[PDB]
Every structure is written in C-alpha cells, then in structure tokens.
Amino acid sequence: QREANTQSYLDQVAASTLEQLSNADYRSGLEAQRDAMGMNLDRAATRDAITK
Amino acid sequence: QREANTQSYLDQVAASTLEQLSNADYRSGLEAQRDAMGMNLDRAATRDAITK
C-alpha cells in the first residue's frame, strides 16, 4: 500500500505540463498534497521530483 | 523512527529558498536544529545538505 501511494503521487507530478510547474501556485498545492500524507510515502524518492 | 527523524529534517532544508540559505542567519538556526536531536538522526547523510 505504501508503494502504491508513492507511485500514485509521483504520477501527478509526472503528468503536468512545464508551464504549470513553472507557475509557483500550482506546485504549492501539488507539494502540499505530499506534506499531508505524512510518512505513508517514500519521502526520499519524492523530494527532488518536481524540479527534476 | 530514526529514519523518520532524518527525512523530516531533510525536508526543511530541501524546502528553503536559495536567498534564505545564502543569508548566514537562517542557516545558523537550521543547522542548530540538527545539533539538538543528537545521535537520533543519520549524521552522515545530513551534514553537507545545505551546500548541496
């Protein structure tokens, strides 16, 4: 379940257009979703995702 | 729990603006927060975080 949760989050960032991620209001909410799942994710493989 | 503490610290440094880290007063407190948790962290993958 933890693995599935991690991939479910990562898909959202993977399926966003560059213009959206550039705007610093979409990414605020997008990374607030990962700050509310607590440690039910893999917080070491979902940190430098957006930028990457 | 130790792993959780490590990730929780690393997130703070990873979610800071470059201008904030450049100013040598924010990073003082930021790296003082890792000198009070003692050996309850991973002090090997935690020292050269601000510079990276």
Automatic annotation (TrEMBL), chains A, B:
It comes from the Viruses. This is Uncharacterized protein. It comes from Pseudomonas phage vB_PaeP_DEV. The chain holds residues 54 to 105 of 521 of the full protein.
